[PDB]
Amino acid sequence: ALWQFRSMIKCAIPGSHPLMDFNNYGCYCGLGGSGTPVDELDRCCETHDNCYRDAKNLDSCKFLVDNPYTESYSYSCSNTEITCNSKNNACEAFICNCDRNAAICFSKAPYNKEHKNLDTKKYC
Template sequence: MKTLLLLAVIIAIGLLQGHGSLADFQKMVKFTTGKDLLTTYSFYGCHCGAGNRGTPKDATDRCCRARDCCYENLRKRGCRTSFQSYNFIFQRGQIVCGKK
């Protein structure tokens, strides 16, 4: 049981590093796919979760790579993306980004 808890904490920390608000991203993934971010995508492909190396294996992995690229570009511009909360709503079955 302790091993499982430790693994969950390590996964959460790995996903938080440089990837914006994990809670907000979890909501977006759950809304869009109906799946849990941590249990479904923590070790998915080459770019979802920790790692970010190699050729993406499919469309989901390409999406993770694109998201990582966006956050890296924002970080280079001085934005603090690690814990930045998203401002978004769900509207007519879509995620709509809000303004801050």
Template structure:
């Protein structure tokens, strides 16, 4: 009985620890997007590339291309035996009063590279905000994204 309780506690600890890790970087990206005055929900399931994974090779618009470039940025810095895992790291950044974003980790570290990928994506979102089309969000898109994005 005591062994079962210990196993449940250990499993719970491991589950919450590992379940929380991938969200670290996503939470930081969310805060960067919010710093620019947008909702991070605007980019979940947008077009072919925004959100978790992607649907294919096409790009709907400039906002979707920002997401594609973000995915490619993560791909570039990922890999290797001791490689960078940008979705798992936490990094340091500062939101400037003019709306800018400053990544503050040491140059050439995984943390800094992940921050730079996120910063560039958020700056891209801001640059193309006027072309943002809410009809490209999941749930509002009138069509099959799996077909449209191939």
């Protein structure tokens, strides 16, 4: 679920709490998404959006109001190391992994301040 995703991100990137703020990043980091990713970090979010999209397509899965972000799963954090609980059901496991991959992608991408709260109606 969204809040778990936030938590999962702080795990892989400690000094990140202040960035989940009211803000949004690039063309895909936030909700919706349109046009083309503006950089590596934004591409991570686009990839994550496509991942959720694949989840919504699994005929064996149905999420509340078709929003994978509502799906709560179980996961644990070690030393910035994320582990998805094997007890999660198939649908939850897919989401957990999407969130995990994104968290890892985020930790490796550069953060470009000029993309914070980018005017999406203009540049996306």
